[PDB]
Amino acid sequence: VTRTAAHTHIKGLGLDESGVAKRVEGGFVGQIEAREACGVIVDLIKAKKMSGRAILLAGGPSTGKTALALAISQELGPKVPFCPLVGSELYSVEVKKTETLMENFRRAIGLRIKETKEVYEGEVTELTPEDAENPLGGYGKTISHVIVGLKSAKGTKTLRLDPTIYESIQREKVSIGDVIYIEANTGAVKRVGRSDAYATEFDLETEEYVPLPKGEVHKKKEIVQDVTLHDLDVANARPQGGQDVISMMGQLLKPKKTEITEKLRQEVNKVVAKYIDQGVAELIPGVLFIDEVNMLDIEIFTYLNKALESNIAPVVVLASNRGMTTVRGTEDVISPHGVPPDLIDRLLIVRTLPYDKDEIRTIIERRATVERLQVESSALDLLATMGTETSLRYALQLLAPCGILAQTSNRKEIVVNDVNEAKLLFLDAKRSTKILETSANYL
Amino acid sequence: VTRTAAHTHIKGLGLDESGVAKRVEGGFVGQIEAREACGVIVDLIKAKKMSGRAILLAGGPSTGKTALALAISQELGPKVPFCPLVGSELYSVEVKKTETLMENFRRAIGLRIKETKEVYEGEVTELTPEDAKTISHVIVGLKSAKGTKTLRLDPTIYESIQREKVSIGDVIYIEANTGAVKRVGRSDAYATEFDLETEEYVPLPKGEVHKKKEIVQDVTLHDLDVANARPQGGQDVISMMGQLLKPKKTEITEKLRQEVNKVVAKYIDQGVAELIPGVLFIDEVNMLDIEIFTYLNKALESNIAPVVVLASNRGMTTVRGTEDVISPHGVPPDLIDRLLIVRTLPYDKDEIRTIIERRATVERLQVESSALDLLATMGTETSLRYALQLLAPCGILAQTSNRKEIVVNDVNEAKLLFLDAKRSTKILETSANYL
Amino acid sequence: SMPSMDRFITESAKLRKLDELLVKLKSEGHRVLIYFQMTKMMDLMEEYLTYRQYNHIRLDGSSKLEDR
Amino acid sequence: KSLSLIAAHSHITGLGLDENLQPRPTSEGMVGQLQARRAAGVILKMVQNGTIAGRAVLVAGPPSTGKTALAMGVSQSLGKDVPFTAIAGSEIFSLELSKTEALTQAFRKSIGIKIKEETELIEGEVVEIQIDRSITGGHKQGKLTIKTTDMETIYELGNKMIDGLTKEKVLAGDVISIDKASGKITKLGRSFARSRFVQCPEGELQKRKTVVHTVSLHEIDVINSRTQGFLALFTGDTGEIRSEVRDQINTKVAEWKEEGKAEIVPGVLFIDEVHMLDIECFSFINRALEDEFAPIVMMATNRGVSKTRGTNYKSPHGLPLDLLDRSIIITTKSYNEQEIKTILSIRAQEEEVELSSDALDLLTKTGVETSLRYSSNLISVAQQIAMKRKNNTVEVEDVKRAYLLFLDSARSVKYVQENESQYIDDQGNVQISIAK
Amino acid sequence: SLIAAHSHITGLGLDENLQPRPTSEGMVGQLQARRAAGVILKMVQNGTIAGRAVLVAGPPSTGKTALAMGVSQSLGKDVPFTAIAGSEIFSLELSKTEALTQAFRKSIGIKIKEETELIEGEVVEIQIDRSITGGHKQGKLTIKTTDMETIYELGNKMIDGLTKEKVLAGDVISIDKASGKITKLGRSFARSRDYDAMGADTRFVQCPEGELQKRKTVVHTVSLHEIDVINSRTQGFLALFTGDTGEIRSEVRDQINTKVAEWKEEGKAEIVPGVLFIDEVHMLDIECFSFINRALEDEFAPIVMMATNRGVSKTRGTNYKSPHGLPLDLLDRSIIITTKSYNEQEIKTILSIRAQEEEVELSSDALDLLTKTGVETSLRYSSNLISVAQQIAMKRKNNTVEVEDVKRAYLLFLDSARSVKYVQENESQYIDDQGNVQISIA
DNA sequence: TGCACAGGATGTATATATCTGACACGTGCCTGGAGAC
Ligand SMILES: Nc1ncnc2c1ncn2[C@@H]1O[C@H](COP(=O)(O)OP(=O)(O)O)[C@@H](O)[C@H]1O
Ligand SMILES: Nc1ncnc2c1ncn2[C@@H]1O[C@H](COP(=O)(O)OP(=O)(O)O)[C@@H](O)[C@H]1O
Ligand SMILES: Nc1ncnc2c1ncn2[C@@H]1O[C@H](COP(=O)(O)OP(=O)(O)O)[C@@H](O)[C@H]1O
Ligand SMILES: Nc1ncnc2c1ncn2[C@@H]1O[C@H](COP(=O)(O)OP(=O)(O)O)[C@@H](O)[C@H]1O
C-alpha cells in the first residue's frame, strides 16, 4: 500500500506550546533535551532575523541525528527551503568545491514574487505575411511583417507581428485553427492544441482538442512564484529564454557548471532588494543540512569560516559521529568530531545520547506498527534483548524477514521460531567478524 | 601624482663609456662587480649575434638581483622585448608546462615593421554605385571644412559601407590600406530635419579629407604563432559578445613554428622587417620542476632562443620533484654546466644609510639627520626592507602633527606600531594559544 | 504548461468517482439527471462534459421562461 | 539597497578615530585594541594618499581577537568608489584557472580607473502622442506633447523615434527618459494621476548630466582580450588571459593618465586566512608586489609556527621568511572582562535583545571563562527561550537554560573523552551495543 | 549467445515453502544462502519496503556471483537488475556521488499505461503537399477497409513515415497512433502496370474487414534515470546512448520525484523497484560509503546487494583495517549472508553440470580424476580443464574424454601453485621487485 | 445578597437559486449636406 524506508514514522519534534517535549509523541521516543534544543532552533529559523548561525549534532552511531534534522524539516513546513547534503557531494570534477559550497549556500534562500504577465491568447484564424523588396539584399530578413488574426470568447483582435516574434511562432509549428498562447514578457509562444470548433476524428497525430479561451485576447494576470537565489544565479549565468541568437544557442549546448563571479551575485542581490523595496517580494531563509561532516577537508572548512560571516547565509546544521579524529587533508592535528577548533568556536554543539532497553523495545514496537505487522509479546521481548545485545538497527532490519518467514508458514503473527530462523539465516557484524577471525583463506 | 613601488629609483646601471661603475650613479649604491658584469651582458645582447646564452645571478635575500634585472631592462631600451616571469607561472591547467615555456621563449623575440596609415574622413555628399546585379564600382564624394574629394571604390568596400548603413550626409572614416569603414554619425547640417530623432549629430572635421602618417609596428613571434593557430577560426573586428564555444590553449606543433619562421625569413630579406632578439627574465628559478629544468636544456640549444636571465636565493637545496639531489641554488648540475654565475654581495651600514636617504628623496620626504642614523641602525639590526618600508608611516605620523620633517619620535612610534619578523617570532614562542 | 483537464478531474474525489460511474453508465446506454446546489459546481461540470464530448443541456435560475 | 539580515560584523560602521589618528575607547562599534586601530588608521591614510603601491600588511593574533573586524572597519571607513576585494585563502585552488592566474585576477580587481563623461537626456511627463500612419506603413507622421512642471513643448517625430515609441508602449501620463543618441527610452512609471507612481520632473527638459564611472583593470583586460566578451565577467570562464593584452592595457592606462582623460585609484586586496596558500602562491606574491599597478595587500592569520603548505618545514605564521621580510606586522591582543562586556552589550543592542544586568554579568563571566563567540551566540537563542514563556527581557534562568541546552567545546571534549567507546576513533573501532 | 561462466543457472531452485532442493535449476549445495536469497527475492517481489542493504561474503570460488545470477534469473522481466563492479564508479567525467546516484536511479522502474488507436486498412489515395525547399509538409490520406472509407490528415512525422518504406496506393498498412509506427503488411491489389525501378515484391495479403479504428491499452516500463536524462536538456535521448549526461542538477531530480508521485496519484503510473548488485564492493573509497549511508535512507531506493571476498583488509581512502574492507557504519545498516566451502560431492555435481552445459561427454574415471584435482587445486581450474580435454579428445578423433586427455591437459597447463613453485625454483630468470634479472645462461 | 457558570436564543456569513430591471447594440430610410457649374 505504502512504501517505508528507515524513516516516515516521524512526523515532527512533538512538543507542546511551552516547548516541553513529551516522552513519546510525534514518532519520537526519548532524547528530550535534543528535541527541545531543536525546537529552540526551529523558533530561531522561523524568526527570520539571523544569518549565518550553525549547530552541530554530536553522538554515537544509531542514536537519532539524521532523524532530528528530518524532524526539523517536517516541523518547518514545505514553504521554507531545505537542502540536504552529504559531505562527499562537494567534490565535483566540473568545478571546484568552493563554488559548490557557495552554490548550496545560495540554494537555501527562498523568495516569493508576485509576477504580472501580459498575455495575448486566442484561436488563430488568419496567418498572412508580406515580403520585403529585396530578399537577397544580405541585410534584413526575408519577410517584414506577419498579420495574425486571433479570436477568443466574446472578442477578436488582429496583430501585426514582428519577424522576431514570428520565429518563435513558426518554431512552434502553428497553423490556421490552432489555439495559441503568447507571453509578452519573454516572447515565448505555447501552442495549446487544435480548436474543437472543427472536426475531431480526422487526425493522425494524437493531438489535444481545447475550447476557446474565455475573456478578451489581451490580458493581464498576477502569478505567485517560488524562486531561490541560486535559480536566478544560474539563469543569468547561462541565459536561455530570450529570442536572440545567444539565448537560442544556449539551449542547444551541453550545460556545464561554471565559477559564478561575485559581481553577478551583487547585481542579483541589488535587483532582489529593489523587488523587496517595491513590495512585491518576500524573503524566506532556509536550512542547509550537511550530514557526515567529517568527510570535508581543511580547505572547505576554511572557506566555510568565511562563508558563515556573510549577511545572506542561512542556518547550517551539521552532524558527525567521531570522537577524536584527525581532520582530512592534514597530518597531525587532532580535533573533536573531526571539526577544526576555529570552526568549533563558531558552533553550538547539541549532544545526543544512546538509548535503553525499554526505549529500544518501544521503538521496535512502533516500527512494527508502521510496517503493518503483528508481533507476539515474547517475540517482541526477544527482539528487544537482541537489540540490546547486538544493535538497534540489526533488530530493526530483522522484522521484515521475520514477516516473510511468518507469511510462508501461512500465519499472520510473528512468533519465536521465525525470530530464531532469521537469527540463523542472517548474521550481524560481530558474528561475521568472529567468523573472519577463525577463517582459512581470508573469508 | 607619481606612484613609487619598491623600485623606480633605478634608472640604469650607472656605468661610464668604458664600463667602469661609479659608486653612486643611476640610483645604484655599491655593487660594482655585478653591475659591470650586467653591463657586459647588455653589450652582448646589443651585439645581436648569439642565441641561447644564459646567465644566473645568485645571492642572499634583499641584495639587489631584481634591481639589476630591471636595470638591464632599462639599459636596453623599450624597443627590445623583455618578458618578466616568475617560476610558479609555468604551471597552467590548460596546457603542459613545456608548451608554456616555449611560449615564453618565443615571446622574447621581436620584429619591427615599417607601415603607412592613410585615412579619409568627412561628410558623404555623393554615393553613386555603378554596375557591369553586381556593382562594378562606387564613387564616393567626401567633404570637410577645407574642401571636398571624390574617390572611386571597389565593391568590397561598398559591401562594408552598406553593412554600416551609410546614407547621404553621414560622417564616415575610410582607411585606404586596410579597407576599414567606420560611421561616426550624421552631420550637424541635417540636425533640424526633425525635432526628435534617433541619429547622433557631429560637426564637420576641421582638417583635410586626406591624411597620411608613418607608423612603426612592433610584434613578436608569439603573436604571429597565436594569430596563425586559432582553433575555432577567425574573428571579426568588433565582437562585444564572445564566441559560443570557448577556445582554450592548444599544444602548437613544430610545423607551424617552422612555417612562421620561413615567412618571417622571407619578409626580412626584402627589407620590410627587422629582427630584434630580447631577454627572458625568470625570477625565483628554484620553483621549477625537474622536467622543466630538463626541457630548458633542449630549448637553450635552438637557433632562435633569446638570452635567458635567472635568479635564485637558495643555498644547497633539494631540487623540486626529486628526493635526494642536492645542488647549489636549487638548480641541477647539468643545467649549471650551461650558465655563467654572477655573485651578488650584501651591504654594510653606510650603504644602507645611503639607500634609505635615496628612497626618502624619491618618496618626497624630509628626514632629519638625527633620525637617519637611528633608521640605519634599525636597518642593520633587523632588515633593510623593514627600514625601507617604515618611511611612509613615519611620514604620515609626522604630517598628522603638522610637521613636514621626520623627527625620531615618529620613528619610535612607527617601531612600536609595526613589528618585524623577529619580534613577531618572539611573540609566537612566548605565547599559549595560537599567538 | 496550461492547467490540465485530467488533473481538474483527479484533485476532486467526487468528480473522479462520478467519472468512473458515468463510464459504465454511458456503456450501458442510459439517461441520467444530476442535481446541484452551486453555479460554478455545474459550470465546471459543463467543462467536464465538453471534455468528454457528451450531449447535455442545462436548466437553472438564469434560464429564461421560454427555454424551460 | 544592499539586502542583509544581520551579519557577525554588522555592528561595525568603521574605525573609531579622531582627526589626530587617536582611537576613542568606544566609537563606531569598535571596542579596545587601540594600537591595532591606530595602525589601521595609518594604513587607511596610506591608501587614501594613493602615492605609493605594493605594500604588504600582516594582521596576526589569537583566534577571535578582532582580526576580521579590523578589516571590516577599514572597508567601511574606505567609502564607496574605491575597490576592495576580499577573498579567502582556499578560493584560488581552481579547476580551470592556474593559481598564479587567479592571484593575478584578484590583484587586478583592486585598481580602478575614473572616467567622467557627460550626456544629454530628455525627461518629462507625456501629455499627448499623435501618430498618423499609412496603409502599408511606408511613412509615419508623429507629434508628441511632453512637459515638466516648468515648460511645455511639442516635438515633430521622425521614423525611428516612432518605431522606438510603439516598441515599449507609452501612453499619456507616463514619465519617460529619452537618450537622443542611442535611442533608449526608459519608462520611469506613471505620474500622480489617479484617474509605480513617480513625481513629475522639474526644471528644464533637456538636462546635461555628468556621470563618473569606475572601471577595474580586470574588466578592461577581459574586454580587450578578444577570445571572450564582457559576459565572462558574469559567467566567470575567462580562462587564462594572456600577458600581451595586460601589457597593452597598462601602456594605454599610462597614456590616458598623462592627457587627463582618466585617473588611477588604488584599492585594498584583503586575503583572509593567508596560511592556506601554497608556496608557489607565496613566490608569485613576492614578485607581484614590486609593480606600479599593485594595490595594498592585507593578510590575516592565526597560526603560530605552523607547517608551510607544499613544503616540509615549519615557519612563523605559516609563511616563508621572504614574504615576512616584505611585510609589516600588526599584532592583536586578548580582551579583559570590560571589553567583553562592552562587546556583548553592542551585540545585544544590534540584535534588538533586552538584557537584564545580572544576565549581562553571567554572560560576561561565561565569556571570560570559555570564549567570546560562545557568549555572543548564546544571546539570540536565549531570546527565543524568553519569548517562549511570554517574556520580553532575558533573565538569568533563560541564560542558564541556554547554557544547559547548547554545549561549548570544553564540555563536549570532556563528554567525548569519558565515553570514548561510543564514538569512532582514528582506527575505525566503535561499539554500538549497550550490554557486554 | 555463447556459453558463459554462469550460463547453466536458471533460477534459484526453491519450492513453495522457500526450501531449497539439493540439485535443481543448476544450483547445488549452499542451502542456507539459497534460502536467504529466496527470502530477499520475496522481499523484492513484495515491493513494500525500500533501502535494505544485503551483503554476501565468503571465500573465493564459493558461489556468490552465482547466487546473484540466480536471484536475477528468478526475478524475471520488467524488473530492473543493475549489475555493476566496484571500479566503474571512478570516472573522469562524473563525480563518485553522481555515478552512484545514477546507478541507484537505474534500478527503479516506472510502468506507464497509455491509450492508443490502431488503424489497419488498404491505401487508396495519397496526397502530399510540400514547399519548394521541402521543409513544410502536409497532406491527406484516404484509407479504406471492406466496409468503411475515411480521409485522414497527415503531419510531418506521418509523411516521413510514409516516404520511408514507400507505400504505393494499394498496400495494406498498420498505423499505431500513440507510437507513430507505420508497418507495411503487403500488397492486395497486385497491379500489372508498374515502373521498372523498385522491386515491389511484397507478399499477397487480403484487405482487412470490419472496424477501421480500434482502441487499445498498452504499458511500458521506463527507468527513473531515463526520465532524468530525457528531461535534463534538449537532446537527452541521444545522451541515453552516448552517455554524455554530465552532472544532472538536483532541481531536475526533485521535480521528477514530484511528477512521479503525481502520476502514481492519478493512476497513470506505478512504481516497480528493483535490485542493484555491486560486485567487488571493497574497491570503493570511504566517500562512496559515506554517500551510500545516506542514499539508503530515501524512499526511492532499491534493494542493494553487495558481494565481497576480503577478510580483515584495509579500507580504501583511509589508513586502518576493517572487516570485509567496509567501515562499521555500513556494516551496522546491512544484513550479512555467509557462504561456505564445498565437499567433494558438490564439486563432482558442479563438474557434471558444467560438462553437461558445454556438451562434453565424460567417462566416470575422468570425472573422478577431475573431482580429485578440483579438491586439491581450485574448482575453477578443473572447470576450465574440461573444454581443453575436449579439444584434445577430437585431436585423437574420439568424442569421449578419457583419463589420458585429462592427464595431457593437466600436463600442458599449470595451476597457481605449480607456477609459484617454478618461479621460486628459477627466481634468477624472472624480473623481481628490484628489477634484477639474469638473461645470459653462461 | 451578589456572583459565576451553563444553557438557550439569535445573529450572521457567504455562496446559492430564481429572477426581474434598466441599460447598450444590429437593421431600415430619407433627406439634406456635398460636389459641380
Ligand atoms: N528517538 C527515536 N525514536 C524512534 N526512532 C529512532 C529514534 N532515534 C533513532 N531512531 C531510528 O534509528 C535509526 C538511526 O538513526 P539516524 O539518525 O538515521 O542514524 P544515526 O543516529 O546513526 O545518525 C533511524 O532509522 C531512526 O528511525
Ligand atoms: N645597490 C643598490 N642601490 C639602491 N637600492 C638597492 C640596491 N640594491 C638593492 N636595492 C634595493 O633593495 C631591494 C632589494 O630587492 P630585491 O633585489 O628584489 O631582493 P632579492 O635580491 O632578494 O630579489 C630593492 O627594493 C632595491 O630597490
Ligand atoms: N574590537 C572589537 N569591536 C567589536 N567587535 C569585536 C572586536 N573584537 C572582536 N569582535 C567580535 O568578535 C568576533 C570575532 O572577531 P574576528 O576577528 O572575526 O575573529 P578572528 O580573530 O578569528 O578572525 C567578531 O564577530 C567581532 O564582532
Ligand atoms: N551452487 C552452485 N551452482 C552453480 N555453480 C556454482 C555453484 N557454486 C559455485 N559455482 C561456480 O563457482 C563459481 C563461483 O564464483 P563466483 O560466481 O565469482 O562467486 P564467489 O566469488 O562468491 O565464489 C562460479 O563460476 C560458479 O559457476
PDB file of N, CA and C in Angstrom, chain B residues 384-408:
ATOM      1  N   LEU B 384      67.031  45.471   5.885  1.00  0.00           N
ATOM      2  CA  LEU B 384      66.995  46.662   5.044  1.00  0.00           C
ATOM      3  C   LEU B 384      65.573  46.975   4.596  1.00  0.00           C
ATOM      4  N   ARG B 385      64.802  45.938   4.258  1.00  0.00           N
ATOM      5  CA  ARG B 385      63.440  46.131   3.774  1.00  0.00           C
ATOM      6  C   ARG B 385      62.517  46.649   4.866  1.00  0.00           C
ATOM      7  N   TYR B 386      62.768  46.269   6.120  1.00  0.00           N
ATOM      8  CA  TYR B 386      61.966  46.784   7.224  1.00  0.00           C
ATOM      9  C   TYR B 386      62.225  48.267   7.448  1.00  0.00           C
ATOM     10  N   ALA B 387      63.472  48.702   7.275  1.00  0.00           N
ATOM     11  CA  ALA B 387      63.772  50.123   7.383  1.00  0.00           C
ATOM     12  C   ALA B 387      63.215  50.895   6.196  1.00  0.00           C
ATOM     13  N   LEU B 388      63.209  50.281   5.011  1.00  0.00           N
ATOM     14  CA  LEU B 388      62.693  50.967   3.830  1.00  0.00           C
ATOM     15  C   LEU B 388      61.176  51.092   3.874  1.00  0.00           C
ATOM     16  N   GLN B 389      60.489  50.081   4.400  1.00  0.00           N
ATOM     17  CA  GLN B 389      59.034  50.103   4.431  1.00  0.00           C
ATOM     18  C   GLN B 389      58.471  50.934   5.572  1.00  0.00           C
ATOM     19  N   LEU B 390      59.312  51.420   6.476  1.00  0.00           N
ATOM     20  CA  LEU B 390      58.859  52.207   7.612  1.00  0.00           C
ATOM     21  C   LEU B 390      58.891  53.705   7.349  1.00  0.00           C
ATOM     22  N   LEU B 391      59.248  54.128   6.138  1.00  0.00           N
ATOM     23  CA  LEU B 391      59.372  55.554   5.859  1.00  0.00           C
ATOM     24  C   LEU B 391      58.012  56.229   5.728  1.00  0.00           C
ATOM     25  N   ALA B 392      57.062  55.576   5.074  1.00  0.00           N
ATOM     26  CA  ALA B 392      55.749  56.172   4.845  1.00  0.00           C
ATOM     27  C   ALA B 392      54.850  56.254   6.086  1.00  0.00           C
ATOM     28  N   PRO B 393      54.796  55.258   6.998  1.00  0.00           N
ATOM     29  CA  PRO B 393      54.128  55.530   8.283  1.00  0.00           C
ATOM     30  C   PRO B 393      54.786  56.631   9.092  1.00  0.00           C
ATOM     31  N   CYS B 394      56.114  56.761   9.014  1.00  0.00           N
ATOM     32  CA  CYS B 394      56.800  57.873   9.664  1.00  0.00           C
ATOM     33  C   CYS B 394      56.374  59.207   9.067  1.00  0.00           C
ATOM     34  N   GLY B 395      56.253  59.265   7.739  1.00  0.00           N
ATOM     35  CA  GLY B 395      55.809  60.490   7.092  1.00  0.00           C
ATOM     36  C   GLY B 395      54.372  60.844   7.420  1.00  0.00           C
ATOM     37  N   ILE B 396      53.504  59.834   7.505  1.00  0.00           N
ATOM     38  CA  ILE B 396      52.103  60.082   7.834  1.00  0.00           C
ATOM     39  C   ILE B 396      51.957  60.537   9.283  1.00  0.00           C
ATOM     40  N   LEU B 397      52.704  59.918  10.202  1.00  0.00           N
ATOM     41  CA  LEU B 397      52.652  60.340  11.598  1.00  0.00           C
ATOM     42  C   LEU B 397      53.278  61.714  11.806  1.00  0.00           C
ATOM     43  N   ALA B 398      54.259  62.086  10.983  1.00  0.00           N
ATOM     44  CA  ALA B 398      54.797  63.439  11.067  1.00  0.00           C
ATOM     45  C   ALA B 398      53.814  64.458  10.506  1.00  0.00           C
ATOM     46  N   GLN B 399      53.129  64.111   9.415  1.00  0.00           N
ATOM     47  CA  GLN B 399      52.168  65.023   8.806  1.00  0.00           C
ATOM     48  C   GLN B 399      50.912  65.176   9.657  1.00  0.00           C
ATOM     49  N   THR B 400      50.602  64.173  10.486  1.00  0.00           N
ATOM     50  CA  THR B 400      49.438  64.251  11.364  1.00  0.00           C
ATOM     51  C   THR B 400      49.605  65.351  12.408  1.00  0.00           C
ATOM     52  N   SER B 401      50.806  65.483  12.971  1.00  0.00           N
ATOM     53  CA  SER B 401      51.095  66.510  13.965  1.00  0.00           C
ATOM     54  C   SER B 401      51.587  67.813  13.343  1.00  0.00           C
ATOM     55  N   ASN B 402      51.234  68.067  12.074  1.00  0.00           N
ATOM     56  CA  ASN B 402      51.550  69.300  11.337  1.00  0.00           C
ATOM     57  C   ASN B 402      53.056  69.554  11.258  1.00  0.00           C
ATOM     58  N   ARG B 403      53.799  68.515  10.891  1.00  0.00           N
ATOM     59  CA  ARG B 403      55.240  68.608  10.712  1.00  0.00           C
ATOM     60  C   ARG B 403      55.604  68.030   9.356  1.00  0.00           C
ATOM     61  N   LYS B 404      56.530  68.687   8.661  1.00  0.00           N
ATOM     62  CA  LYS B 404      56.991  68.227   7.359  1.00  0.00           C
ATOM     63  C   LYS B 404      58.390  67.630   7.419  1.00  0.00           C
ATOM     64  N   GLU B 405      58.892  67.354   8.618  1.00  0.00           N
ATOM     65  CA  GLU B 405      60.220  66.791   8.798  1.00  0.00           C
ATOM     66  C   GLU B 405      60.124  65.608   9.745  1.00  0.00           C
ATOM     67  N   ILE B 406      60.875  64.549   9.447  1.00  0.00           N
ATOM     68  CA  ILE B 406      60.817  63.339  10.256  1.00  0.00           C
ATOM     69  C   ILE B 406      61.601  63.554  11.543  1.00  0.00           C
ATOM     70  N   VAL B 407      60.918  63.409  12.672  1.00  0.00           N
ATOM     71  CA  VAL B 407      61.505  63.512  14.000  1.00  0.00           C
ATOM     72  C   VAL B 407      61.578  62.095  14.557  1.00  0.00           C
ATOM     73  N   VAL B 408      62.632  61.803  15.331  1.00  0.00           N
ATOM     74  CA  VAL B 408      62.909  60.457  15.838  1.00  0.00           C
ATOM     75  C   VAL B 408      61.789  59.900  16.725  1.00  0.00           C
TER      76      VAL B 408
END
